[PDB]
Amino acid sequence: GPSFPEPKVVRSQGGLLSLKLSATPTPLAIAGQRATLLTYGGSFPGPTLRVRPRDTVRLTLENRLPEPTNLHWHGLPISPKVDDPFLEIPPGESWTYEFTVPKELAGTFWYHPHLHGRVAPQLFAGLLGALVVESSLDAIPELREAEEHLLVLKDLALQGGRPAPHTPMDWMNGKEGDLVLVNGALRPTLVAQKATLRLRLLNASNARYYRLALQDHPLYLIAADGGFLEEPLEVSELLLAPGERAEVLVRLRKEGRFLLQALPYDRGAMGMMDMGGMAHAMPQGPSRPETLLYLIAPKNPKPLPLPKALSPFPTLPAPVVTRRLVLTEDMMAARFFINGQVFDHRRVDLKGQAQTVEVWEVENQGDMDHPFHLHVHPFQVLSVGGRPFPYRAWKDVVNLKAGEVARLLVPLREKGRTVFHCHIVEHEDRGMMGVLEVG
Numbered sequence: 001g002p003s004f005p006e007p008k009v010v011r012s013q014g015g016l017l018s019l020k021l022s023a024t025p026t027p028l029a030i031a032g033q034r035a036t037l038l039t040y041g042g043s044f045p046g047p048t049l050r051v052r053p054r055d056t057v058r059l060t061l062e063n064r065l066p067e068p069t070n071l072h073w074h075g076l077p078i079s080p081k082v083d084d085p086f087l088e089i090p091p092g093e094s095w096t097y098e099f100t101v102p103k104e105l106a107g108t109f110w111y112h113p114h115l116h117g118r119v120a121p122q123l124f125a126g127l128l129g130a131l132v133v134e135s136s137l138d139a140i141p142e143l144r145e146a147e148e149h150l151l152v153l154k155d156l157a158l159q160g161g162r163p164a165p166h167t168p169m170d171w172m173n174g175k176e177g178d179l180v181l182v183n184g185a186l187r188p189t190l191v192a193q194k195a196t197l198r199l200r201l202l203n204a205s206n207a208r209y210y211r212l213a214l215q216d217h218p219l220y221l222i223a224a225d226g227g228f229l230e231e232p233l234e235v236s237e238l239l240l241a242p243g244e245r246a247e248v249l250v251r252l253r254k255e256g257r258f259l260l261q262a263l264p265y266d267r268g269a270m271g272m273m274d275m276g277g278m279a280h281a282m283p284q285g286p287s288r289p290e291t292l293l294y295l296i297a298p299k300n301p302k303p304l305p306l307p308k309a310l311s312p313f314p315t316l317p318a319p320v321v322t323r324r325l326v327l328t329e330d331m332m333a334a335r336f337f338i339n340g341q342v343f344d345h346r347r348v349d350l351k352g353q354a355q356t357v358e359v360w361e362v363e364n365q366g367d368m369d370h371p372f373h374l375h376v377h378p379f380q381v382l383s384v385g386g387r388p389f390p391y392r393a394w395k396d397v398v399n400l401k402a403g404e405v406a407r408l409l410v411p412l413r414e415k416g417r418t419v420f421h422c423h424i425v426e427h428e429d430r431g432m433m434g435v436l437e438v439g
């Protein structure tokens with residue numbers, strides 16, 4: 001097939017994407033070996049859903065797993081009656097998710113399980129897929145003429161032909177795997193046919209971080225989690241935390257082979273160590289460098305000029321409340337807290353008012369990175385760690401290194417009960433989640 005593996009795409013037809021999608025243990029060939037994963041649509045990753053604003057999505061999820069599950073439409077500002085984090089689809093049962101794609105939306109989003117307590121094993125076993133919202137901006141020549149690819153960054157570990165089980169230490173750190181894959185393939189080769197590439201990036205890992213760098217090239221950031229930037233932003237590297245998305249332009253200036261690497265990154269994962277005195281926790285340190293893919297430039301490459309502008313970011317109304325949400329950890333217990341509390345599905349933690357804007361100060365007082373995710377209501381990151389954020393774009397995950405405070409501008413959109421949580425999904429399963437009610 002094509003030298004570059006990418007998930008199969010399902011496009012909306014006539015303004016409607018209607019599809020039956022089963023969650024099922026699936027035998028398949030993965031990184032040169034046979035394994036049984038948990039998949040949507042018989043594939044890992046699941047199929048990419050490509051839609052346009054104002055399309056209708058009708059996704060009937062059939063649960064063929066031996067455990068209950070549900071779907072989070074990660075990043076979509078839709079009703080929490082649809083993106084329902086509390087719904088349980090029992091084994092053998094089905095549920096139809098139906099929503100309209102918002103008019104003012106563009107970018108790379110994704111779908112995955114969100115049944116509290118089972119998210120980490122279900123997502124690790126392979127239940128995830130992408131959703132792309134096409135934009136009229138994609139028709140400008142600087143984007144139209146680029147060669148576009150989706151890169152689903154997800155790692156895996158196999159044991160006896162199945163996803164490796166979670167250990168106690170996995171529940172503390174978040175589980176990372178030794179197979180560091182792109183679109184389910186082990187270090188694929190991308191033989192570019194155009195000198196400009198448009199790469200949609202998805203970190204769908206449970207916990208692994210990707211400190212992205214392309215040999216000999218900068219990246220041109222054009223979209224964050226949930227929308228375009230106002231203009232391209234040149235970066236030498238790009239950290240993608242669990243759950244985050246980004247889109248970059250790559251401008252191939254010379255012929256040659258270039259590595260896309262996940263450079264060493266210390267996210268504060270811990271191990272255990274015993275030097276006489278009994279065992280005590282010790283930092284794992286930075287991750288080993290990983291090669292993600294091989295990028296081959298075309299002959300005599302003449303890249304397109306970058307777009308001068310993308311999408312103006314909306315001027316938001318003045319905020320009416322400031323929230324403070326403090327993240328803490330009890331590592332040896334693998335318990336994780338927001339303002340000193342663990343998740344309780346019956347407890348409402350924040351009550352806000354639709355169509356107002358709030359300032360959320362999220363403070364990481366732990367020692368690990370925690371990627372903070374808010375459902376339903378995309379936000380503008382104003383600052384992290386006291387540094388002004390270098391661009392304006394909708395995000396829905398923000399990474400917090402130990403000690404850092406992020407200031408977020410949060411317009412409240414759809415009414416109903418939704419959640420916020422760490423997107424190291426083990427931490428969510430172990431209690432680092434709270435409930436927001438919007439009325």
Ligand SMILES: [Cu+2]
Nearest residue numbers: 072074112243
């Ligand atoms: Cu998510």
Ligand SMILES: [Cu+2]
Nearest residue numbers: 072114375421
């Ligand atoms: Cu969630």
Ligand SMILES: [Cu+2]
Nearest residue numbers: 370422424427
């Ligand atoms: Cu966390």
